[PDB]
Amino acid sequence: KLEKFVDKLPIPKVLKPHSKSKEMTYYEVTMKEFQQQLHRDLPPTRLFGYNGVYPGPTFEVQKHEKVAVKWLNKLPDHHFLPVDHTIHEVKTVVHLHGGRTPPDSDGYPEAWYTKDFQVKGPFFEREVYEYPNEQDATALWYHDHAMAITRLNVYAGLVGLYFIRDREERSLNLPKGEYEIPLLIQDKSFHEDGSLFYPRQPDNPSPDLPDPSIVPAFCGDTILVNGKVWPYDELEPRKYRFRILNASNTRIFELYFDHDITFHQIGTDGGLLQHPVKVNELVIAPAERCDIIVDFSRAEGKTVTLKNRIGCSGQDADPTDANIMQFRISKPLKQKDTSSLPRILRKRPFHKINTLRNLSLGASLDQYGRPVLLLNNTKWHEPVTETPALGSTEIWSIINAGRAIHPIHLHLVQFLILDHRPFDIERYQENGELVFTGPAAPPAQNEKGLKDTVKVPPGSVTRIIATFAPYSGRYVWHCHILEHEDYDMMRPLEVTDIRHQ
Amino acid sequence: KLEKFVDKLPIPKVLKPHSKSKEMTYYEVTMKEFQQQLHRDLPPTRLFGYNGVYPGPTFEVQKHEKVAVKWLNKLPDHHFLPVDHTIHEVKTVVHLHGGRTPPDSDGYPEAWYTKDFQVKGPFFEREVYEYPNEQDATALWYHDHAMAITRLNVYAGLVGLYFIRDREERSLNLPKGEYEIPLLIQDKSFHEDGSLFYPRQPDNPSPDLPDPSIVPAFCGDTILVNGKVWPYDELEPRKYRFRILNASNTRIFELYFDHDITFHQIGTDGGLLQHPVKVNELVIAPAERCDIIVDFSRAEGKTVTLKNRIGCSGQDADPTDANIMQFRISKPLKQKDTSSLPRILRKRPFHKINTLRNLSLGASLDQYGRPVLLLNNTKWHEPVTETPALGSTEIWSIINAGRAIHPIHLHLVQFLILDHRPFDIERYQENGELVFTGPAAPPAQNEKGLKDTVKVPPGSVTRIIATFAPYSGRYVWHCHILEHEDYDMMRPLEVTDIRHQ
Ligand SMILES: [Cu+2]
Ligand SMILES: [Cu+2]
Ligand SMILES: [Cu+2]
Ligand SMILES: [Cu+2]
Ligand SMILES: [Cu+2]
Ligand SMILES: [Cu+2]
Ligand SMILES: [Cu+2]
Ligand SMILES: [Cu+2]
């Protein structure tokens, strides 16, 4: 179903502010319900989107630029996706993923609000968010974060891009303009209606199981890029810059080109790497970003398809979800490609270690027999335990006793991945003891940079180092598989300033 | 007991040939029983060694140098280590690990011989081996390979070094002379006698168990380097070249320095890399080699200890086997360090791909209840199945359904590690179908060179690609955990020439 590579790759328009001064740059974005055609042969798709478009408008901000956004809710009173009323209306709150944001503008899950702020969550306090943008140039993105329905609102189309620029990044003569292309890759499933399909219950729903019921994992049979089903793009035989983002609910990608063409990765979630990394395949979990350079100069006239290697459970991808999009190197070379792939990308490096933390990834069963994925076997309602001090540098040991990868995400900060190491699963479930069973392995070279989301392998412990700065207050950390996050792999993160005790 | 860092680090003497001409360089090495003091506070240890020294003499050969060695057996009638007479006297045959050697001089396990060639194995042919040395510069090593008792003869002390030199390697101004130090690392256990300890049976043997009985794994409590228990070495504050080798029976090391000093790996088992790789920790399984450069120039007066992170089952090392040796940067800098750490090492890179092979790692139980580790669930007695054609390129998929790492080693060839990928263990032990459960991962950057031994992770499939050239005939491939190789993880490898039908 759905013929591949018939629609052209859409580029989200750069959002224009309502007012821009030397003090502040003020934006207004509204969440509206609408229809949008996602494939040449599909009927329009009912979606929740920012400024009536999917994906939302793209923010272009600068370092130090004080940006203010008023996120307006104009969505209906009822959701068009199956809402599980038993895990915790259309509630909305906007979170800038990876943004160095004070807690009052970070998009707390319980700071949600309905249309026109008429019904507010218990943590609501502001209608106009402010982003100081005191972080280095990188690729961020914004999406909904309302509690218990984050999997639905994000899947409904509430995602958008957000770029930060530096004088350091611009000093690098990188492919810019039309030669910098963002790839917001997502997976979805459609009815014959053309509308989104999201399961109401697991496969064989028992009678007394709640209806609707949250599923432990969802992944669609159709791959989209920038809101277009298996699109295509006509490029020039030169160097391009791809800002790749995986905004799926669950699906992990393993991207590769069907020709002998290599990705040159120059940046991660947090910003630029120190030197480019020559990689043939990109393993990108949900919410992970990859800043890559691709050279098509030796490929004039060829048809290069961006491919995916793995399915939803890590198996070999079917030659339907094995396709991302198709590049056709047929556009004539306008000007000479004078863009650069410099050997050095940063110069500047990325302490005392004040705190150590052990955090377990697991699951429990509720009264209906559903798996409840948990952080430290602790529900979201429970009191806060991850309480780092303002300015503290900590090493988090993330212990994955599950069957598959968990992409764990921390708010506010950008961390570094230390190493992965396997441990004894049986000893861990019977004793709580962490006995290692193999040598430690550093992260891949293209994951040595600043990141806010890390793939924690199954049966292994992932160590990250993080400096909780420069804002104190209430944040959260969670797994970015939204089906896990909503029930209930999410926990509060309280950064505390110390002054007089 | 055994105080650490009280004996100086021995350097094995280079072996002098008996006769050297334009045609051939002829050597003679004898295996003799002798006693050698391995620690300052240990009585001399009974050993089997080449030329009455442990480790054996070091060969220094050239590329294209036709080297001939006549390995002579002068060993006693009785082996001092416990011999299992149920798995398949002092039988000996010398194998040049990693050498591009014709089969008649490769050291086939059943080409063994007793003292003065009295009794000869069923595959014996010649007394003088010839090594054409038509391969690039690398660090090899020679050790005993007699069938059913390879774990005993190697543990008895029948190991030695063998270096090949190139004009390419020499063109690199690498640290040479006394500033190139080989680190032959091993582990052993000692009786109060000072003699070697090696278990006769597993821990709790039923009376139905044979006596002696092979164990699935042995690792000693004491770490040796170049035949000296926890030695030390006084170095100058400059760059050194370490040719590290793991010659243990089973133990896998994770080497690191207790100071902020980085390994710059320049070569692997098969020879030089293309570019140096900055690594903080070296994971070296048995038979693996690591050519690394260490810069001590900023450590004048410091005491730098080479440490080991992991133990026998991959757990955290005990602060006794966590120590390898101690480097004391106290020798004054003689001459100015003019050696080079060049950014380019090889220039020239490392085909059609004719054959694909799936090879499983597992274990069965014999009549006595002992685990029998097997390749393709097939005994060594059984007919040969790995029959590549001369000059053909193959991709071997090594499927490890076991609990721990298996260092799989192939003879004759040097291969390139493609990737690792997890699979479903439970589905694999039911219908034998291979279902992957995660993304593929390329090898670490410092394991991208030519290799002849690869760490196959548990629950993962390690893909290797090899070209079987230029000698046809009978070789073997096996796991280099000697307790596994002897019972019975060793299978024949037949390279067949084709020319007429
Ligand atoms: Cu996010
Ligand atoms: Cu976030
Ligand atoms: Cu998860
Ligand atoms: Cu979040
Ligand atoms: Cu060997
Ligand atoms: Cu070998
Ligand atoms: Cu093994
Ligand atoms: Cu061998």
Author numbering:
A (entry chain A), B (entry chain B): 2 to 89, 97 to 358, 362 to 512
Give the original sentences from the paper that presented this experimental model.
Laccases, also classified as benzenediol/oxygen oxidoreductases with an Enzyme Commission (EC) number of 1.10.3.2, are multi-copper oxidases having 4 copper atoms arranged with oxygen at its center. Laccases have been shown to catalyze the oxidation of phenols, polyphenols, and non-phenolic aromatic compounds through a free radical mechanism, where the enzyme facilitates the transfer of electrons from the substrates to molecular oxygen, resulting in the formation of water and oxidized products. In this work, we present the crystal structure of a CotA-laccase enzyme derived from Bacillus licheniformis ATCC 9945a (referred to in this paper as Bli-Lacc) adding to the growing database of CotA-laccases.
The current model at 2.7 Å resolution has an Rmodel of ~17% and an Rfree of ~23%. The model consisted of residues 2–509 and therefore the residues beyond 513 that were added during cloning were not visible in the density. Aside from the disordered region at 356–362, the most flexible is the 213–218 loop adjacent to the substrate binding pocket. Therefore, the most divergent and conformationally flexible regions appear to be involved with substrate selectivity and affinity. As expected, the most highly conserved residues are those in the vicinity of the bound metals and/or those in the core of the protein. To further validate and confirm the resemblance of the Bli-Lacc against other laccases with solved crystal structures, a multiple sequence alignment using the amino acid sequences was executed and motifs characteristic of laccases were found conserved—HXHG, HXH, HXXHXH, and HCHXXXHXXXXM/L/F as can be seen in Figure 5.
